[PDB]
Design a protein around this nucleic acid. Structure first.
Lengths: 151, 222, 126, 315, 102, 83, 56
RNA sequence: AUGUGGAACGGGGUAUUGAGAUUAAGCCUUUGUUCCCAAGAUUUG
RNA sequence: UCGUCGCAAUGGUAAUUCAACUUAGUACGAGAGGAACCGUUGAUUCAGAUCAUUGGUAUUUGCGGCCGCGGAGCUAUCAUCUGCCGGAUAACGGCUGAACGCCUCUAAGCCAGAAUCCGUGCCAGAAAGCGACGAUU
RNA sequence: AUCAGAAAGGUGUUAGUUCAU
């Protein structure tokens, strides 16, 4: 689901978890937006109103990405978090766009739904007058000799 | 008779089906042998004789019902064992064929065990004598080794589709049996390797081309 | 191809000129980008090889080469490393079937076992 | 870290740190043997392994030959298990003691007066009641029984005159049954032919050969199957029934660093730690594996008796 | 198993030892030892080497592919024939030993 | 499609299941003491019967298979008193 | 196959014998599982699980 | 620390090189030869 | 006292990382493609070995004519190779069974199930562990 | 308490209170 994908993106940020931290907060938001964009691309791989909702989600993702850039500029931890929350607020708008998209996606999904150990030898099945002798070890290599060659 | 050689479909390479005694090999595909057993294997005894110590006896020995022409590399005593192991009509003698895959080289047809075009006349004569069936130099599918490239039998010596109509006829006259140009072994130039043609019934590959399997039967009137 | 994988000599090694025994119009086949790339392909293992000599289309374009024989010493049935006449790699199609009409020169029994079409191509197997 | 630290072996003769589990239902039998590695030779044996790529084919593989002369049981040791570990309650030796064992028991064979165990042998001859009481206590109280035997160092062509005596735990039967078997086998030679049927996979323990200023470390190779356990008296020990051709297992011109082997010898595929003329211990594997390789019979086809020294050309 | 004959040293070839070479004309050559292989690689004439058996024979210094029923007695009979040939070879070797001294 | 072959050994103390959805590996389950299986299993211990039934169900379980599509398996039909 | 293959197969052959019993058992165990999972919840997932429970 | 005593050579065997020489040195072995020694001290109840 | 042979408190730790074929060329699947498990073929990595096999190296620096090579021995992803065990259970899903006359992975109990862990095996051995045992100035 | 001890949730208990029948 779209919310699950957002939760997965949030989980990835949680798994990963001043100015450097600010960039990391923006990168985490950007990575979440990238994951959302990847989810949108996967939805596209899996039109009209759905494409418009996907474009609307991308626009909200761009707003979150812009807030992610603002998070990097917000060297202060509170400033970085505040812009990250703005990206989350933009992500909430993406969820609102996803809300219509998921219903279309759900309809599309509904439409789609609608032994290694074996040895053989002909010597066992020999039609020889001396088939038992054929199976028997006749002189072959007398200490590596040519006994079989002579035969 | 389509018979996939386990993962592959080279039933003929593993076993040179011969109305007297099919030249099966040690380690050859049981499913291919059993399907060959169901087709003509009762009449054509599928003795799992690894010709020259190779899992491809049909490629190694020109196993015609008149006899099997083992390669020159194969020991005479081993051939004597193999000839005795196989039925007396299908004698597995060590033909002095320069090709280690003499059965691939020599079209294992019971009527005439047509030898490879690259195989020398002495090798062809040895292939003729060892298999007791005439061995004329033939290049099936543009390949000198007609035995793997042509499903050879007394009933039918079916060539691969890569062989021309004249080339199939050339392999036909060399093996003294009709040669329908059918590319056995998944459409490859290996008709005889894919299809184990015997006089009683021309076996083929289950994973091989269906048209080639029909061509092997059509050439053999089976 | 086919045959049991083992630590044996490889006729069609990567960046090696495995002669295109199979009559595809190519005399030789150098493995610029060997299929499944010490990246090397044993006797009958179809390694994508650009024709070193012969066909220009196969030249400079990696095409499968089922090694007819392995010039390096390859373990025999007794485990004794045996060196064949040459490292010629018979040209094979992408599916593994011998692309060339007929394999020339020495074609090892491993080449015949690896590909039935190579066995068909191996007019003089050695 | 498994082999670290790398230190020289404290014992020249390999000592088995563990023995196979004994079964009361199974008959009393030995579980270990001692031999001297004479060398390694190349032999050709048919690989009768179903489902293998080279099934019903002959393969040339290395075979390690170690002389295994019959071992005379010097005595028995009674170890009683305790909460703190395995405690040796007592040990009883035979009245007659081998010279090599006595020579081995003293660091100065010539300088010694050969008085070792003289009182014990005299006491045993004078009165066997103590031995019977000791044997009864071992059969009634001791939980682990180990038989002490000395190898035939004099029979083997070894410069050392001291026997490589070692203690082997007894697996099979009850304590009284093991004690009775030890008493019957006391001061009696036990051959490896009865112990090993040459149709199973066992473990070989030995000290590696050092390589100058890495080596001299004890190792215990496993999954080793005996290919042929021949007898020195029999001339067909090194010759298979496939083509007869009776010959000696020793290479032409003598074995490398070993000479000529005249007693019973056992040949097994693969290499073992230590150089030629080195004492190695062969014992049954504690864990039983039902693999095809360990279950398929071994039948040698050709045995090469060519001159190992130099570049030999004739077998 | 077959014991091949060396191309240079003209001696028996056993498994594991020696070198086997294949030519473009489907010719198989066997070398008894590394020196024989080196001599073969150097295009050394077998009749021009004193230690070679070919030179000894051709200097005055020395004297069945048909299949049959698989019987161990036939192999034993063939082995007996080889033993008889060995006795004849020993007589030839006796001539070789004396003539080579001359 | 592929019927499952059930074999009883040691008076039903050992149950062997073969060809379970085509599986070529036979599963052997040892019945609890005091319970005999002939599938109807009777015994004097209800807990032993319940545990044996769970083990049989666990043995005849489809792994990486669609439960809704593939309905092959072993399920307890009823359980009551012998007398 | 085509259309509702699963539904067609169920109608022609039948559903699982213990499908209803397993669902009833799972439904009964749902109350115990929810409380146990919340008690054993840890890390960020604990906060998410608590938030979901609080929202519900 | 007085005997297959060992240690040395004499060798032989053995391969090497390409028949010859070195020939066990971490190739083998010695009905061959003599040498030394039924030790020299020390440690320790 | 000199020892000789054993025991193991204790630690290191071992096999490791992946596969394919067989299985079955089939459960699934309209069919094609492709089932768990079985053995095989292996690719490894690491460790254990050894120089038998293979190449060289090589103080037989030996030989034959400074070269042409070199035995022995060493060396090897340069070679030939050999190479762990069941539990406890995690995640996970249970059965039965209270609270909640039932139900309910659970609060009682019975479980199943991991390259994890513990065992197990290997390695070493408490220098300041132990036993048996010989001789005994 | 299966991390004891010296914001909250809990098929977490302990004592329970209040209200329903």
């Amino acid at each position: 689901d779209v919310n699950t994908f957002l939760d997965v993106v949030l989980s990835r940020t949680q798994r990963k978890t001043i100015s450097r931290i600010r960039g990391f907060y923006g990168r985490k938001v950007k990575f979440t937006q990238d994951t959302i964009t990847e989810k949108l691309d996967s939805i596209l791989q899996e039109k009209i109103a759905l494409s418009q909702l996907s474009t609307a989600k991308h626009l909200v993702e761009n707003v979150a990405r812009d807030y992610i850039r603002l998070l990097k500029y917000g060297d202060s931890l509170y400033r970085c978090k505040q812009l990250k929350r703005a990206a989350l607020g933009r992500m909430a708008t993406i969820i609102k766009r996803q809300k219509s998209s998921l219903e279309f996606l759900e309809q599309v999904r509904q439409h789609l739904s609608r032994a290694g150990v074996y040895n053989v030898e002909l010597r066992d099945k020999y039609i020889l007058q001396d088939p038992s002798w054929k199976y028997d070890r006749m002189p072959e290599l007398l200490d590596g000799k040519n006994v079989a060659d002579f035969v | 008779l389509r018979a996939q050689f386990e993962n592959s479909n080279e039933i003929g390479v593993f076993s040179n089906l011969t109305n007297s005694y099919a030249l099966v090999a040690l380690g050859g595909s049981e499913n291919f042998y059993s399907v060959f057993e169901a087709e003509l294997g009762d009449v054509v005894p599928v003795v799992h004789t690894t010709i020259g110590g190779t899992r491809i006896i049909g490629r190694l020995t020109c196993g015609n019902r008149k006899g099997l022409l083992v390669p020159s590399s194969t020991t005479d005593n081993e051939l004597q064992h193999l000839r005795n192991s196989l039925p007396d009509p299908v004698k597995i003698q060590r033909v002095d064929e320069r090709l280690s895959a003499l059965g691939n080289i020599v079209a294992c047809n019971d009527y005439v065990a047509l030898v490879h075009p690259d195989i020398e006349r002495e090798t062809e004569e040895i292939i003729a004598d060892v298999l007791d069936v005439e061995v004329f130099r033939q290049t099936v599918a543009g390949n000198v080794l007609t035995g793997s490239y042509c499903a050879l039998s007394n009933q039918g010596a079916l060539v691969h589709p890569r062989t021309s109509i004249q080339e199939q006829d050339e392999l036909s006259s060399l093996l003294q049996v009709p040669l329908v140009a059918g590319t056995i072994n998944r459409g490859s130039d290996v008709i005889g390797a894919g299809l184990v043609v015997n006089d009683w019934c021309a076996f083929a590959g289950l994973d091989t081309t269906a048209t080639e399997l029909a061509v092997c039967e059509s050439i053999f009137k089976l | 191809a086919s045959g049991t994988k083992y630590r044996m000599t490889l006729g069609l090694p990567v960046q090696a000129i495995m002669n295109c025994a199979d009559n595809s119009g190519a005399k030789n086949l150098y493995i610029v980008s060997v299929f499944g790339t010490l990246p090397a392909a044993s006797c009958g293992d179809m390694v994508l090889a650009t024709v070193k000599k012969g066909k220009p289309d196969l030249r400079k374009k990696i095409m499968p080469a089922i090694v007819v024989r392995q010039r390096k010493a390859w373990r025999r049935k007794d485990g004794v490393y045996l060196y064949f006449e040459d490292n010629a790699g018979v040209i094979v199609n992408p599916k593994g079937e011998m692309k060339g009409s007929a394999i020339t020169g020495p074609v090892a029994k491993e080449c015949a076992d690896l590909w039935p079409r190579i066995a068909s191509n191996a007019g003089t197997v050695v | 870290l498994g082999f670290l630290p790398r230190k020289r072996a404290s014992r020249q003769r390999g000592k088995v740190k563990a023995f196979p589990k004994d079964d009361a239902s199974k008959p009393v039998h030995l579980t270990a043997f001692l031999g001297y590695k004479a060398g390694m030779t190349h032999i050709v044996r048919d690989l009768d392994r179903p489902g293998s790529k080279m099934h019903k084919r002959e393969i040339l593989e290395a075979v390690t030959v170690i002389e295994t002369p019959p071992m005379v049981v010097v005595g028995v040791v009674g170890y009683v298990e305790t909460p703190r570990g395995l405690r040796s309650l007592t040990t009883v030796w035979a009245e007659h003691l081998s010279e090599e064992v006595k020579r081995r028991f003293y660091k100065n064979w010539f300088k010694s007066k050969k008085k070792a165990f003289t009182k014990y042998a005299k006491k045993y001859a004078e009165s066997t009641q103590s031995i019977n009481r000791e044997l009864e206590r071992i059969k009634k109280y001791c939980s682990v029984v180990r038989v002490l035997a000395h190898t035939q160092i004099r029979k083997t062509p070894l410069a050392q005159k001291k026997a490589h005596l070692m203690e082997i735990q007894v697996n099979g039967g009850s304590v009284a049954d093991k004690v009775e078997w030890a008493r019957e086998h006391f001061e009696k030679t036990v051959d490896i032919k009865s112990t090993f049927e040459q149709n199973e996979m066992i473990d070989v323990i030995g000290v590696t050969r050092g390589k100058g200023n890495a080596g001299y470390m004890h190792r215990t190779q496993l999954n080793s199957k005996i290919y042929r356990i021949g007898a020195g008296d029999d001339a067909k020990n090194a010759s298979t029934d496939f083509d007869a051709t009776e010959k000696r297992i020793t290479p032409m011109g003598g074995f490398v660093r070993y000479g000529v082997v005249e007693n019973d010898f056992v040949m097994l595929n693969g290499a073992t730690p230590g150089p030629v003329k080195r004492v190695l211990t062969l014992r049954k594997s504690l864990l039983t594996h039902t693999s095809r390789k360990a279950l398929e019979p071994v039948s040698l086809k050709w045995i090469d008796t060519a001159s190992k020294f130099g570049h030999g050309r004739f077998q | 198993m077959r014991v091949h004959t060396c191309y240079f040293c003209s001696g028996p070839v056993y498994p594991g030892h020696g070198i086997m070479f294949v030519r473009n004309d489907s010719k198989v050559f066997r070398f008894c030892r590394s020196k024989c292989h080196k001599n073969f690689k150097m295009k050394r004439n077998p009749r021009k080497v004193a230690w070679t058996k070919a030179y000894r024979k051709a200097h005055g210094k020395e004297m069945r592919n048909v299949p049959v029923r698989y019987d161990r007695n036939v192999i034993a009979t063939t082995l007996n024939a080889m033993k008889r040939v060995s006795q004849v070879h020993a007589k030839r070797e006796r001539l070789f030993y004396k003539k080579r001294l001359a | 499609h592929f019927p499952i072959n059930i074999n009883l050994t040691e008076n039903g103390t050992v149950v062997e299941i073969r060809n379970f959805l085509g599986e070529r590996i036979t599963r052997v389950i040892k019945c609890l003491p005091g319970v005999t299986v002939s599938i109807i299993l009777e015994g004097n211990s209800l807990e032993n019967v319940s545990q044996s039934a769970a083990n049989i169900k666990q043995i005849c379980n489809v792994r990486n298979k669609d439960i809704r599509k593939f309905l092959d398996g072993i399920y307890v039909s009823e359980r009551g008193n012998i007398e | 196959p085509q259309n509702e293959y699963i539904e067609e197969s169920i109608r022609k052959h039948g559903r699982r014998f213990d499908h209803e019993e397993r669902k009833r058992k799972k439904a009964a165990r749902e109350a115990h599982d929810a409380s146990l999972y919340a008690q054993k919840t840890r890390g960020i997932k604990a906060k998410l699980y608590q938030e979901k429970r609080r929202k519900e």
